[PDB]
Design a protein around this ligand. Sequence first.
Ligand SMILES: [Zn+2]
Ligand SMILES: [Zn+2]
Lengths: 57, 93, 113, 128, 458, 148, 64, 69
Amino acid sequence: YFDDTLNKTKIKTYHSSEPAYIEEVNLIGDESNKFQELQTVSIKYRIRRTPQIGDKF
Amino acid sequence: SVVGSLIFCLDCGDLLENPNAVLGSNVECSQCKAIYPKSQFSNLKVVTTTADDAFPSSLRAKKNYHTLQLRSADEGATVFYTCTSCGYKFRTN
Amino acid sequence: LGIPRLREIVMTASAAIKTPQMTLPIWNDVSDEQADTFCKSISKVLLSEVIDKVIVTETTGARSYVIHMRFFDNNEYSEEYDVSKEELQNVISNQFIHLLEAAIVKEIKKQKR
Amino acid sequence: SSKVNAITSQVVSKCVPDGTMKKFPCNSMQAMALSGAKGSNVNVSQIMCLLGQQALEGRRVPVMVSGKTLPSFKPYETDAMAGGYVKGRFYSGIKPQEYYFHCMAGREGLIDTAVKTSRSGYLQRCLT
Amino acid sequence: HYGIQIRSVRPDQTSQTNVLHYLNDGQVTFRFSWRKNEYLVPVVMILKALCHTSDREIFDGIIGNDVKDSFLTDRLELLLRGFKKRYPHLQNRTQVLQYLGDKFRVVFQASPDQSDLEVGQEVLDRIVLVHLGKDGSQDKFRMLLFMIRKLYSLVAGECSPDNPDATQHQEVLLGGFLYGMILKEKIDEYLQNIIAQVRMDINRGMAINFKDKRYMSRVLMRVNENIGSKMQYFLSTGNLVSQSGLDLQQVSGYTVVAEKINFYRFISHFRMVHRGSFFAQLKTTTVRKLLPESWGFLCPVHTPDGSPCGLLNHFAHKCRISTQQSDVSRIPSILYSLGVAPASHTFAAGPSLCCVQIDGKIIGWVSHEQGKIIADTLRYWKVEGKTPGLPIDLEIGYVPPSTRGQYPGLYLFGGHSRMLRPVRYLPLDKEDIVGPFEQVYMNIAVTPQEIQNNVHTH
Amino acid sequence: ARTADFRTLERESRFINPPKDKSAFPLLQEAVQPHIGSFNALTEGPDGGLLNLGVKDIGEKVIFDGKPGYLGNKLSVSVEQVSIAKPMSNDAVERKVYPSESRQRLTSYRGKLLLKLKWSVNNGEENLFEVRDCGGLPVMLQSNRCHL
Amino acid sequence: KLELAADTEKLLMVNIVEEICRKSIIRQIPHIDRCVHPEPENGKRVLVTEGVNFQAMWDQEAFI
Amino acid sequence: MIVPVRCFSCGKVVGDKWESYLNLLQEDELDEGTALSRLGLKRYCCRRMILTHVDLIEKFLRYNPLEKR
DNA sequence: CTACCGATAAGCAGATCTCTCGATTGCGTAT
RNA sequence: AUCGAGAGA
Ligand SMILES: [Zn+2]
Ligand SMILES: [Zn+2]
């Protein structure tokens, strides 16, 4: 996102030690009658849980 | 009117005052305002007994068919048989 | 036993423990019958342990009470507790009646308020 | 409980290991029990002979206010099975009533283990 | 330490508990709680406020034909004489109601227009035996006499303490009824908020007019109306923020998050019933025991291990919970046909007669043998769906006479929150529905191979 | 016979084409019957429902104004009808909002709560009725206040 | 027979009498609740009393 | 979900047999044992893979976000 | 005849391995 | 940061 209060483009960051794949990205628009910009986006991750040594069966 | 240690007025149905806590020959109902002479109130004998369980002591210690009644006692019991070989069921009265 | 007793002993050192007991060695010349008789004559016996039933005939004809006390048979309670007629009469005359009067007067003073 | 435990002891001492089909050392169940690798003669007896009396809080199974210990049993039923005596083994399976009683006992055991895992935690620090 | 606790519930499914403590001096006190505050009241004061009754009526109601029970007679003499000596005045129900109204004015936020007599009638209608509802003062009087008899039997040792933690004496708060109760409470607080807003208007600015639509719309805009937001807060947090307090113990953790780890977890979320957060922080472990009263209602196996063991138990998969009030109106008509003497002109008491009671309301009196016959007949006609007055769900909770066991009587139940399970009625071989209260007295074989003659009925 | 059986063919058919008449496995819904019935009973049933019964039981709470025995004009506000609406949206004519939309939006699935206040003054001289929105009341799925 | 003033109210006279009968002792030695004779374990024959009072048992040297 | 291409225990390719198994169950009145035998699955390790497959992808496929419903 | 020391009924202070997730003050007020 | 639900030994 580009910030006008900073005049610089800032990114977020995947904050998790376990890597994942992007499953789906949902664009959610606010229900208010006015037509604002995009402000809420939902991002889903997919994690491959291959059975390894230590996990319970 | 009088049962055990309680005296009730014949008309009002109210519990009269304790006979020995009132003036002589006159006890007054709190609602009837009636008159009951202190006669015929000789013995207010109330006899009690211990709990029969308040004294735990070692001596104390040392001392297919299914008949059924449906309507009343007068009518006879109804037996609801059920054979197990065939599953046929019937009732006998 | 277990954790409760370890608590009583080493965690708080209670002067009043739940089950205070003391062991009494016996002389080798004392028969088991004599030991049992000694145990009976040492163990406490309340007045309620010889009472069969109590009948209170309250009459207000000045408010009286006739507290009849019924005991077990003598050849039963004397055998069970080693308590005789004389000791029973003594305790009734000295302590039981006194405690009864004390309780009655305390209740009377309570009912005034 | 004393009488039915005497009967249980009779059964197990009679039927193990004389009545077993596969015998030691071929019988790995008895091999584990006797060898001390896992289990015990109690577990072997419960699997192979019977489960015995179910003891709850140092007593038998609780009894409702009507004298029935379970809906299946008539009031004041003088029978060992009613009071919790399981004449069933994990090899052959237990009836519904005995299953209910064994669930009572297992729940009590789980509760006791959960309490005992830390009932003695303050004492160590108070001493140390 | 004796007492009698009854959890009466209003027709809108709101609860009000009324206890009857016993004092060693012979007097019985009535305890309730309007807001989060407990209040004590002599039982004879309410017994006289309920209806125009004398002292002989109370005596002949609490004592039946057993005038020779010195225990009962002495307790009753002490109770009546103590009331008459502590309150020498109040010789009439009008005076008793006026005294009650004077006692409870600030606590109830009664309006100044409300007379003391009608405030006493209001506390009577909102406190004592709410399930009988308004216009049921005679029924409340009879039920209070029954409860006093039962308390005296309990202290005399002729009755056993009903177990609060046994499933025989429990039901389940369905969680939608809780939603309805909280909604009722929130709209009540909304009404109080608008009243307080017009109160502040009165105290600040003289410009008022209770006939002005502009004034109404202007004052409503100054109150908070987000009842939906308050409900969302309750669902999100679990906290039961109540200004008055419900009849429940805990205040938090009422809503769990339905986890979706798998379908087994999800489906078991909707079958679990909890004892409460109170018993999690405790040491006594008699409430976690698996009991025979849960046979067919609570699962013997499904219960977590660790802290919530014995408290977070689940229902049997065939355990049905009644969410609707059964048609009970014509059952009293059926009972009078069987032999039940009407409870208006019978004058009977004591645990020597069967107290036929429907949904917490006395219907009549009958002997114990005839009460057993009536229970059997009601079961027969309930399973055989011919008689239109008996729903299949009716819970015929009969209790027979014993020696120092439970209090005898015929206790028919209907209505919400009951626990029900299907069991096969052996005569005429049809499905029957039984509840925990009646189950503990009926023989229910577990397999058709083990039916015993003249023993099992189901 | 067979003690049990894989129902392979009917399982595959029911997977490919779901039923149109009624859901199979009736026992799967009798499990959640208590919750659904509890929520349904507060907006339907005899006597109008639990919410209507509760607002009837609450009654009216009155106040006076003190204007000139005679305390002034009364104000007996009360509620006699509570209605729950199946959730809608205004995005005009209101549409239907579904729990799939509620989950996707990461917002609640709540209907609209309407109470008609009874602004009575002076024991019925005149009554100023008015219905009013009271925020969004969350509703439980598969209940009579849900589109499903 | 017991008697009281007429002005007094009614008394239970069963509960208090029962409490007094529980309280009053016939024959007790201080702090000793019960002395019992368990089976002789480890060979030695011992008695165990509920409650500790050493100086009260020093007097029964003929048996202890 | 979708038929496993290879049997877990041994490795015999059973992924090409699910449709033929369904056909053998549907057209012919063959039970599961006879159908598995005719498909060439001898070891019970191979038999279980096709006998117990659930094929949940059919239920997964009805939620298609790329098609007007 | 009153001061001082016990002595039981009452009041008051206090602890009883790791890890996830979810939720977060009510009105009032002067423009 | 705090209090509620749950989980592992
Ligand atoms: Zn009178
Ligand atoms: Zn294979």
